[PDB]
Ligand binder design. Structure first.
Ligand SMILES: *CCC(=O)N1C[C@@H](n2nc(C#Cc3cc4ncn(C5CC5)c4cc3Cl)c(C(N)=O)c2NC)C[C@@H]1COC
Ligand SMILES: [Cl-]
Length: 280
């Protein structure tokens, strides 16, 4: 189906090197000229998603549905945005924003030391940006279902971009279930809400302030649910302020209705940024 407003000429795309394997599908980096049609030949580095060589008809419909979902959700500075597609005269290419610094977990773990060592204010800024992206997704009735630092990408300009949204019988056996990021009611029922996303955001906050730590260190998966239901929660990360830990703890309220909304989390993290600039 034709959609000129999103179509890019193949002649203006130069496909480049692949970007890793098996987590966001078959992705390659590319140079695209004239994405914005009012900017003449302005060059832009992009990430391209395409089908595998042995792809089935269902795989094509899946990628087309993912593309249509990106068109419907709309644009926001803190999500991986759709820039356009090559749908005519060749294989399907879905162009999205390129994030040079990789996923947030690896970005954090590489900046624990060295000249590019992240400051406390940089970590608060990262959390604020992810909350803004999630506030946007929730406003568009989109539940992420897998919010975690591994699913946030970082641009050359350190902009946080939520990725792995859009795409999203369990009782029969045929990426494992992300149990350590799941709200107790999500673990229990295997149902997701914006409120279970807020719990996941709390775990992501803990990932940010531990600079990529692994949640619930030392807890066997068979003990996790009982402990969370009894009120067990992760301890405050070292160097983390009491206020930020209270935000994490409110994200992890046992009652989904008592957790903050993403709109409230944006406000709370904006407050923490202000108070951080005063205690230094
Ligand atoms: C998975 C990890 C891995 O291989 N790499 C490569 C590196 N990478 N991955 C992406 C991407 C992407 C992406 C994300 C989406 N979320 C939704 N959707 C559409 C609905 C289907 C997409 C599509 C794609 Cl292509 C990028 C990027 N976009 O720039 C990058 N850049 C390096 C991340 C990770 C390495 O991390 C250390
Ligand atoms: Cl919300």
């Amino acid at each position: 189906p034709a959609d000129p407003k999103w179509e890019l000429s193949r002649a203006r795309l130069t496909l480049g090197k692949p970007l890793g394997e098996g987590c966001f599908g078959q992705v390659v980096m590319a140079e695209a000229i004239g994405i914005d049609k009012d900017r003449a030949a302005k060059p832009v580095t992009v990430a391209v998603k395409m089908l595998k060589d042995d792809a089935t008809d269902k795989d094509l419909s899946d990628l087309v549905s993912e593309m249509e979902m990106m068109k419907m959700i709309g644009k926001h500075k803190n999500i991986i945005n759709l820039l356009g597609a090559c749908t005519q005269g060749g294989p399907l290419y879905v162009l999205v924003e390129y994030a040079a610094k990789g996923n947030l977990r690896e970005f954090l773990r590489a900046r624990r030391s060295g000249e590019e060592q992240l400051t406390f204010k940089d970590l608060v800024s990262c959390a604020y940006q992810v909350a803004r992206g999630m506030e946007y997704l929730a406003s568009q009735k989109c539940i992420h279902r897998d919010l975690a630092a591994r699913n946030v990408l970082v641009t050359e300009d350190n902009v946080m971009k939520i990725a792995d949204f859009g795409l999203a019988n369990l009782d029969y056996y045929k990426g494992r279930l992300p149990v350590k990021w799941m709200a107790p009611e999500a673990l229990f029922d295997r149902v997701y809400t914006h409120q279970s996303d807020v719990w996941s955001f709390g775990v992501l906050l803990w990932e940010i302030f531990t600079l990529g730590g692994s949640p619930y260190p030392g807890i066997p998966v068979e003990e996790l649910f009982k402990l969370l239901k009894e009120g067990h929660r992760m301890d405050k990360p070292a160097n983390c302020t009491h206020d930020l830990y209270m935000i994490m703890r409110e994200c992890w309220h046992a009652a989904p209705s008592q957790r903050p909304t993403f709109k409230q989390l944006v406000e709370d993290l904006d407050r923490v940024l202000t108070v951080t600039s005063h205690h230094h």
